[model samples]
Target chain A: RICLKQETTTCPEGEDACYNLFWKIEMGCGCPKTEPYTNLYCCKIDSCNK
Target chain B: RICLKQETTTTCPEGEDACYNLFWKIEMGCGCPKTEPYTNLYCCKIDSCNK
Candidate 1:
């Protein structure tokens, strides 16, 4: 499953390892960027590396 | 390299990447209740308190 709409459009939909593009409105501390940040990650439950 | 892996909790130097514990929690169109979406990458960091 693909997460729709990235903050930065940095990660490619199919090729890139990003997923879960949520608005992140309710969050706090130590993240990489203040802007262009996302919760979207890949292979969370399963691996595409297989 | 050890990552802040999903579902697998740890006593990380810092974890779950937030502003101290603060992170960009963007809401996506897709959702998985029992799943996370990252692999082994030092993609996110956490608070000094957490570290």
Candidate 2:
């Protein structure tokens, strides 16, 4: 919806002209790591696959 | 493609459900204030998720 209206989201990947977000899940801590600390990156559409 | 398949894709922040996705560039590493990380969740059908 909102994203659709937009062409491409901003890429923190620096000079990455075109890119897409990726799903990254990390879990740690001997205690309860309730929320999955997800990581994001602006991958070059041509260089990677979803 | 990556689903688009699902609203969310590869990388994302924490405590977010039904998000988009991201590419990380987590230079200082992921987590609050310091990074002020951005994130996205998975929602295949936006309409359904909305409902």
Candidate 3:
């Protein structure tokens, strides 16, 4: 079975606010012996409200 | 207000399994001229099914 992965980033310095982390997972499948691989990319923001 | 920071890691290759990411944030408060600094740590896993 295959599933999507998720991850978040840490907040910056000197900030009392919560930051939102976003990520994306890319995957591809081909061949029998060779399995698929996935990549994760993420970013952080000052606030979720924005 | 005070808050905590969070972070996570990317997935590994050649596996159909899912991975879970976790992170922790540490903070300290001081006097006016200087505020507290925060640090983040994260790790990835094969699945969230395990702790």
Candidate 4:
């Protein structure tokens, strides 16, 4: 059987925003900074990033 | 006020599928072969594209 880490962290008071980052490794390449193949979105609701 | 053309096209019988295309022209430069500013979506519901 395989296992993965699953957990949650409590945010500080009034900090309702969650940030996420995305990386694309299969669009053809060798780690170039500022690539246009990446996108991100933030949410304020519970487990929105999940 | 000026108005823009707005109308819908009829689909063929049972052509349950629809296609969309996109083109992007500004990030920097003279229109590269591909730019991700373009995106497309299609829906099957009535007027789903608008409402």
Residue B17, model 1: Cα distance from true site in angstroms = 8.9
The DockQ leader among the candidates is 1
Instruction: Give the alpha carbon lDDT tens digit for every residue of B1-51 in model 3.
Output: 111222222233443243322222432121111122222212122243212
Per-residue lDDT of model 2, residues B1-51, tens digit only: 121322223333444333232333322211222223323212221212211
Segments in model 3 whose C-alpha atoms lie over 4 Å from true places = A1-37, A45-50, B1-16, B24-51
lDDT of 1 by residue, B1-51 (tens): 122333223443332333212122432211222233333222233222211
Total colliding residue pairs, candidate 4: 0
Question: DockQ of each candidate's interface versus the true one?
Answer: 0.12, 0.04, 0.03, 0.05
Candidate 1 residue lDDT tens string, A1-50: 22233232232334434333234632211122234433323332222212
Lowest-scoring 10 consecutive residues by lDDT in candidate 3 chain A?
A26-35
True contacts kept of 2: 0.00
Chain A TM-scores in order: 0.20, 0.18, 0.19, 0.48
lDDT (10s digit) by residue, model 4, range A1-50: 11111224545565443433244322111112233322323334444443
Q: DockQ for candidate 2, please give it.
A: 0.04
Q: Native-contact fraction for each model? A: 0.15, 0.00, 0.00, 0.00
User: Candidate 4: which pairs clash?
Assistant: none
- Per-residue accuracy of model 3 over A1-50 as CA lDDT, tens digit each: 12122322333343333322223332111111122223121112232211
Best-to-worst lDDT order: 1, 4, 2, 3
Return the lDDT, model 2, position B43: 22
Native-to-model Cα distance after best TM-score fit, residue B21 in candidate 2, in Å: 3.5
The candidate with the higher TM-score, 1 or 3, is: 1
Model 3 accuracy (lDDT, Cα)? 0.24
Tell how far residue B36 is off in model 2, in angstroms.
5.2
